[PDB]
């Protein structure tokens, strides 16, 4: 429907890992989804790794 089941990208620059290394783990989102007939609020999660 929308975004990605799994997107992996390579970031090149200075001090990239010194700033982005705290983004690993899980991120939770609570909202009214676009794929919802009713107005029900739903909770979902995404998983992020930095290498």
């Amino acid at each position: 429907h929308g975004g990605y089941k799994e997107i992996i990208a390579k970031i090149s620059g200075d001090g990239v890992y010194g700033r982005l290394k705290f983004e690993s783990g899980g991120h939770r989102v609570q909202r009214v989804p676009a794929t919802e007939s009713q107005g029900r609020i739903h909770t979902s999660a995404c998983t992020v790794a930095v290498m």
Binding site: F22, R28, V29, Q30, R31, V32, I41
Partner: protein, 48 residues
């Protein structure tokens, strides 16, 4: 990320903010500055 309330909360350092829209447009620096502030504060302590 709570969209109905427009809030973003971080559970590692227990910090909540009401600037979700600025975060989702790419200004997440204010989220990662405090964490490092805590993190580095432990690097000098672990000298024993």
């Amino acid at each position: 990320y709570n969209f109905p309330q427009g809030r973003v909360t971080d559970h590692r350092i227990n910090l909540t903010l009401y600037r979700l829209d600025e975060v989702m447009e790419g200004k997440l620096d204010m989220l990662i500055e405090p964490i490092i502030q805590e993190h580095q504060a432990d690097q000098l302590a672990a000298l024993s």
